[PDB]
Amino acid sequence: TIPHLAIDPFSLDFFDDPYPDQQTLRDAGPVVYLDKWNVYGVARYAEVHAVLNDPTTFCSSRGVGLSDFKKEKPWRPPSLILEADPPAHTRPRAVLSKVLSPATMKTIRDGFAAAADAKVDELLQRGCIDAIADLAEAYPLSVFPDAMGLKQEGREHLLPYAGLVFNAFGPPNELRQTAIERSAPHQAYVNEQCQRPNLAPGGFGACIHAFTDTGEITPDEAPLLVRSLLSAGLDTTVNGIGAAVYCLARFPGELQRLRSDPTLARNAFEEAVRFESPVQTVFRTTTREVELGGAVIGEGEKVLMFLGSANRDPRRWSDPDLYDITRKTSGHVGFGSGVHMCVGQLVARLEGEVMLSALARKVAAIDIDGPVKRRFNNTLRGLESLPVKLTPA
Numbered sequence: 125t126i127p128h129l130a131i132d133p134f135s136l137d138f139f140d141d142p143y144p145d146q147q148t149l150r151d152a153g154p155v156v157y158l159d160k161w162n163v164y165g166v167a168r169y170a171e172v173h174a175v176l177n178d179p180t181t182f183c184s185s186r187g188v189g190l191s192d193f194k195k196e197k198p199w200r201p202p203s204l205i206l207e208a209d210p211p212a213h214t215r216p217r218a219v220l221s222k223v224l225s226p227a228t229m230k231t232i233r234d235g236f237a238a239a240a241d242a243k244v245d246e247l248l249q250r251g252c253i254d255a256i257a258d259l260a261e262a263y264p265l266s267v268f269p270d271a272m273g274l275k276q277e278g279r280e281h282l283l284p285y286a287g288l289v290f291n292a293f294g295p296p297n298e299l300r301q302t303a304i305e306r307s308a309p310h311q312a313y314v315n316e317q318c319q320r321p322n323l324a325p326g327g328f329g330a331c332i333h334a335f336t337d338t339g340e341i342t343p344d345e346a347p348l349l350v351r352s353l354l355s356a357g358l359d360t361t362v363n364g365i366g367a368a369v370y371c372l373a374r375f376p377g378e379l380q381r382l383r384s385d386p387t388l389a390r391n392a393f394e395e396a397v398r399f400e401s402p403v404q405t406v407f408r409t410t411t412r413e414v415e416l417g418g419a420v421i422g423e424g425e426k427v428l429m430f431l432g433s434a435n436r437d438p439r440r441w442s443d444p445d446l447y448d449i450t451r452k453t454s455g456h457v458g459f460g461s462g463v464h465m466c467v468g469q470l471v472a473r474l475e476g477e478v479m480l481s482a483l484a485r486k487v488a489a490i491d492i493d494g495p496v497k498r499r500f501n502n503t504l505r506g507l508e509s510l511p512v513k514l515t516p517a
């Protein structure tokens with residue numbers, strides 16, 4: 125009843141061009157079985173949305189990667205938020221929500237915007253830049269570590285640790301094994317920066333530790349919740365902003381619309397998240413036998429959600445393969461959906477908005493002028509190098 129496919133969604137060929145195989149996954153049926161890894165897959169918007177919004181049946185405490193924490197040891201102690209279910213999930217989630225609150229955004233927005241304008245001004249002086257290293261990476265590295273309260277020394281561990289975290293969600297292929305092989309120095313740095321004395325006053329890290337006396341979290345929970353932000357808070361925005369610049373570089377018509385109305389910056393970034401879906405995949409584990417799309421999935425089965433495919437499903441979207449900065453993007457699953465929906469999305473959207481605003485006001489053209497190189501990761505989709513010439517407005 126359930127179609128079996130040999131597609132490996134974690135193969136380099138798949139990463140290089142996932143869209144044909146993602147259509148094959150969608151059109152094979154609402155639920156597929158991936159013989160390569162012995163997991164169920166759902167690639168249509170409807171089933172992805174349904175799974176995300178049934179956390180009781182499709183739990184996260186057994187891991188949101190391929191590995192089932194009930195069968196294998198997690199590569200690191202489980203996250204108190206991402207890898208927890210209600211009710212254990214609820215209070216750690218509330219703390220991170222209050223830490224990354226609208227009030228916090230108001231306190232940091234002006235500095236985030238000034239740094240975005242400064243970076244674009246700097247880049248325009250060079251003209252020919254690499255939109256990854258020099259922008260998508262450089263800008264978040266210029267605001268997020270400081271907003272965390274991190275010291276200067278050791279920040280070079282942040283992106284490697286994030287690449288490790290996101291490769292570790294995948295199956296035990298070479299990408300994952302190599303990441304874990306090299307993990308020790310990055311884990312050691314990150315774990316140490318999670319301790320309260322190492323997080324500067326007023327930043328996100330210190331705010332988490334200050335929240336340890338309300339009865340929501342205890343002091344021994346704060347370090348791992350800092351770990352959550354050092355895991356998820358940087359590499360995601362790098363690939364989000366990279367996605368948006370890549371979109372504007374490829375669709376000059378949309379850059380021209382953005383220039384004509386910079387208030388479209390926030391939705392242009394939201395559309396980029398839908399269009400590229402920097403986070404491609406997430407797993408759940410069934411806690412019971414469950415019917416999904418006519419298939420009977422047993423208990424303790426891994427279910428792979430194709431967020432990027434759901435965000436290009438023509439059953440949900442009109443012209444899903446077009447980048448449209450005035451599209452009504454509400455409902456895309458690029459940030460997830462339901463109780464685990466990205467708790468840091470206000471930070472993500474703030475960075476993306478102020479960067480696209482800087483580009484909208486200061487840049488007239490973005491032309492690819494060198495070889496584009498893709499970056500391969502079991503969970504993240506993005507580029508390694510994006511040579512562009514920036515023409516000033």
Ligand code: HEM
Pocket residue numbers: 184188205206207217220224352353356357358360361363364365397402403406457458459460461463464465466467468469471472
């Ligand atoms: C474009 C940027 C980002 C994208 C595309 C993204 C994507 C996602 C997605 C899809 C989830 C759901 C995971 C699941 O359902 O299992 C998630 C959760 C999460 N994200 Fe984001 N994220 C981004 C930025 C950020 C930032 C900036 C932070 C922190 C500053 C952050 C922290 C988290 C955390 C802690 C969770 C777990 C929330 C929970 O389990 O309740 N993310 N993210």
Ligand SMILES: O=C(O)c1ccc(C2CCCCC2)cc1
Pocket residue numbers: 203204205206207289351352353355356360403406
């Ligand atoms: O350590 C954590 O708590 C943690 C780590 C990684 C993530 C990812 C964010 C982007 C979507 C996939 C999951 C979320 C939380």
Ligand SMILES: [Cl-]
Pocket residue numbers: 200311
């Ligand atoms: Cl770790």
